[PDB]
Design a protein around this nucleic acid. Structure first.
Ligand SMILES: [Zn+2]
Length: 105
DNA sequence: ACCGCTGCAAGGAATAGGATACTTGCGGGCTATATGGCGGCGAATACCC
């Protein structure tokens, strides 16, 4: 299919284009109930469902409801492979300098 | 038709016994200062003109 690999820099707008949400909380797992956090580093509303065609809260749990989202979780009921291909984006309060383009010698 | 009496409670000294306020160690729940390796090489100073 494809024939060439292109590589370049990524403007902030394009980075927003890639992302499917924003991370805001440094918390990951409860250690008691192994569901993810609200919108922490892991998440369901940002990255995707945890089980194949399973909304997080369990309002819909069948493949018949593919595509629709939950009205309390907002997750996209679909395969869990999406959890390996969606990317988040953090917002940085201050501008910062890429280290590679600074001490590359 | 008036009174001193008996009698029936209220407050002191000696024992047993549960209730209950008090004290304590934990278990899980949470948050946040090195000193024996070379070799190559290229960039970045130093230098003395
Ligand atoms: Zn839900």
């Amino acid at each position: 299919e494809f024939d060439a690999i292109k590589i370049a820099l990524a403007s902030p707008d394009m980075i927003r284009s890639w992302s499917f949400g924003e991370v805001k909380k440094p918390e990951t797992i409860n250690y008691r109930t192994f569901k993810p956090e609200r919108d922490g580093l892991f998440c369901a509303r940002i990255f995707g469902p945890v089980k194949d065609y399973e909304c997080l809260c369990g309002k819909y749990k069948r493949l018949k409801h593919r595509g629709v989202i939950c009205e309390k979780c907002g997750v996209e009921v679909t395969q869990t492979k999406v959890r390996r291909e969606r990317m988040g984006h953090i917002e940085l309060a201050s501008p910062t300098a890429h280290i590679w383009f600074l001490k590359s010698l």
